[PDB]
Amino acid sequence: LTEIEHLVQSVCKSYRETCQLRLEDLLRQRSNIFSREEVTGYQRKSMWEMWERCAHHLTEAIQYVVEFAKRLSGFMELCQNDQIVLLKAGAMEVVLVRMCRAYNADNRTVFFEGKYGGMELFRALGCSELISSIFDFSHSLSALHFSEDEIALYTALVLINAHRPGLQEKRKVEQLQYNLELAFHHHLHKTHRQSILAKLPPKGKLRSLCSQHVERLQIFQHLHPIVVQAAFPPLYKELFS
Ligand SMILES: O=C(O)c1ccc(-c2nn(C(=O)c3c(Cl)cccc3C(F)(F)F)c3cccc(F)c23)c(F)c1
């Protein structure tokens, strides 16, 4: 009925449509785990081949988040400067949250290229601390057993944040943010899930993990650049220098 319950519906719709894999497909594939032969197969690959595989998977993930943002009510009505500022700071933070869906807390594995595997699968990359921190973030997020609607509403709030430095129309961003906070709060009350609010990761944790991740991606892109057909060209030039 209210403009808020419709907001919940459209945010969940944008998310349902911009998801790469279905939650039940990832849950049913938890049995399909890489063999020790397939693991060594990945470990023996060049850093540069592993980088190309991961770089493409991560650019495609960002592109789905870009589409998710495009479909959020009022995002397109914000100015290009504000759209870049939000996506630059938040798109990879959304990808990192989304990642908990493809993470199995039982054996500490992630769904990568058709099967589940441990962090050792990424050895050739030579950035074990960063990969361990990503696996740790997904492990803490998985303990919340986030529903699909909760992850949709929370990721919208990760993106729509008026506190990002460099915004031109801060007030137009605040209005979008306040409506999404009401929508998230309203939904958690309706479903008796307000208890996750105290369990959500601190703002600084996500920002800190994301800044470390993107800077490492930026080091690899400098050393071995990949080519990507840009979905949002002005965003692409701000990240790919
Ligand atoms: O318009 C597009 O299609 C588009 C696609 C990807 C990005 C993007 N890349 N990105 C990387 O960290 C990244 C990735 Cl995922 C792989 C290899 C190289 C990079 C690099 F570090 F170079 F940016 C991002 C980090 C945060 C926010 C982003 F928006 C991006 C982008 F800005 C635009």
Q: 135, 211 in Cβ contact below 8 A? A: no
Token pair 């399909």 is found at 32
Under 8 Å between Cβ of 188 and 130 = no
**Which of 48, 85, 134, 240 gets mutated to test ligand 1 (max ligand atoms within 8 A of its CB)?**
240
Cα 42 to middle of ligand 1, angstroms: 24
Q: Which CATH class is domain 1-241?
A: mainly alpha
DSSP secondary structure letters along the chain = --HHHHHHHHHHHHHHHS-SS-HHHHHHGGG-B--HHHHHHHHTS-HHHHHHHHHHHHHHHHHHHHHHHHTSTTTTTS-HHHHHHHHHHHHHHHHHHHGGGGEETTTTEEEETTEEE-GGGGGGG--HHHHHHHHHHHHHHHTTT--HHHHHHHHHHHH--TTSTT-S-HHHHHHHHHHHHHHHHHHHHHTT-GGGGGGSPPHHHHHHHHHHHHHHHHHHHHHS------SSHHHHHHH--
Q: Whose CA is nearest to atom 23 of ligand 1?
A: 239
CA-based nearest residue to 8, from 172, 173, 150, 145? 150
Determine whether the shortest distance from the Cβ of 55 to ligand 1 is under 6 A.
yes
Is residue 176 within 8 A of residue 74, CB to CB? The reply is yes
Determine the Cα–Cα distance for residues 165 and 86; give it in Å rounded to an integer.
9
